[PDB]
Amino acid sequence: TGYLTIGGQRYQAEINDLENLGEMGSGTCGQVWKMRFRKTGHVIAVKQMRRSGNKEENKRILMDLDVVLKSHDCPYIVQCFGTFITNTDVFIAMELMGTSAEKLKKRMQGPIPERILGKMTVAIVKALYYLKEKHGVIHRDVKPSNILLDERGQIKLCDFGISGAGCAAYMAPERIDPPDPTKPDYDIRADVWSLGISLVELATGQFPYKNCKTDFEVLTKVLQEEPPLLPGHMGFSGDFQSFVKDCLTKDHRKRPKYNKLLEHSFIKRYETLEVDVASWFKDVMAKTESPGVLSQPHLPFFRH
Missing domain, CATH: 3.30.200.20 (Phosphorylase Kinase; domain 1)
Known part of the structure; x- marks a missing residue:
């Protein structure tokens, strides 16, 4: 039974x-x-x-x-x-969810609107804060495949890996090479970084460390390159750009914790701004439902 x-x-x-x-x-x-x-x-x-x-x-x-x-x-x-x-x-x-954000990005072939991402951010930060405050859990694998959305307009953190080496692409600088390798911390701040990467990816429709061919190469870009911020050309609010910048602070010692994020204007505003995530989601899922195109043949041998 x-x-x-x-x-x-x-x-x-x-x-x-x-x-x-x-x-x-x-x-x-x-x-x-x-x-x-x-x-x-x-x-x-x-x-x-x-x-x-x-x-x-x-x-x-x-x-x-x-x-x-x-x-x-x-x-x-x-x-x-x-x-x-x-x-x-x-x-x-x-609970049955309709898709993850990874699948949504793939089927859309372009960006998720800021207003959806605002609702998403509120939900995911609250879930991560809850996990840490109530259960002592540091998630350690925040990424689009773990952010679920449904036809009700709900946005939730997945059960997969919820209980807490990693997905290179979303790994914080201090998970790759921490300033003090003896400090037990792990630390929530690494998940704040991964959230930032996720938001840039979803807002632009492009993962921000471009054209990497191996896992190690992506790690090198996290460490060597400037943090990959939202573009300024593109119409994103000042508040969203600031939220991302804050999350993508390379020095983890200066990166906000969830309680500070929860006060940020990007979250605060989206706690109460009305957004019809359900209609957006339904419309997108229907429009991307079907397409029919034959793949290219491998080029034949040619002696150059």
Whole structure:
């Protein structure tokens, strides 16, 4: 028996009862099913953790679940409705999101509007602050694939890796080469940097360390080059440009913490400015739904 808390109610459920609407999210491994709970009509994501599965993958699934289970009071973290434990599997019922920001950027082929990014920033900073203040968790993997959006207009931090070497591309300078390698810190400030990179990427439609061909090359650009700010040509508000600049402070000792970010005019304004994220999202997802083009043949050998 599964025990689900959804729609304000508690339900004793059987896993074979859930209507299977097909496999989902082949791009972030772990088996996940889109399912309908027939008693209510909610459509949910159900993760299947096999008893036979890779031990490292299961370890991460369980650690993440532990944090999600105790994060019900954060509006900005995807929720777990409950679990079913069987002889061979654990099925984890999760809130279904429509896409990640990585997928949105890919399907749009261009920028996400500032007003959406403002709502996103408020949600993600609040989720990261919650994780650290309430649970002592330093996320360590902030990036567009971990920022989820839905047709309701909600924006939430993903469960994947929520419980806390890294994705080069979003790594802070002090994760690559800290000014003091003995300081235990890890530190939240590294995630503030990754948020900044993410925002520049999404606001421009281009990851800001251009044309790197290897992981190490990107690390070199983080350390050697100026921080990659929002362009000034492009119509972004002064407040957004400042927020990004602050997040992309190279010296972590001078980079703001979440409590200071939460006072920044970019966040403060978007806590209450009305933005219709739901309509934006629906319109984008429909318009980018379908396209039909044959790939180029490899060039034949030529003796130069």
